[PDB]
């Protein structure tokens, strides 16, 4: 079925440093789960269990399709 809200991951292409305490720190390359983008921060999770808002910036979600085809 769907246990828990979270089917959505988003890989980040660059580095980035949480500025605040409650936002995520990110890594080039690092695949973070998506937990809540709803609010203009978009949450994520990370490898060692932690969460916290990070930008639409140094992330992107992934499970695309077809590549001639684009959600259209």
């Known amino acids: 079925g769907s246990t828990m809200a979270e089917e959505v991951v988003v890989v980040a292409k660059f580095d980035y440093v949480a500025q605040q305490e409650q936002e995520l720190d990110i890594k080039k390359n690092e695949r973070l789960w998506l937990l809540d983008d ?3 921060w978009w949450r ?10 990070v930008p639409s910036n140094y992330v992107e979600r992934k499970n695309s399709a077809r590549a001639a085809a684009n959600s259209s």
């Not at 994520?44 to 808002?53: A, I, P, Y």
């Open 44 to 53: 994520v999770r990370n490898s060692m269990n932690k969460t916290g808002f």
């Open 38 to 40: 709803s609010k203009s």
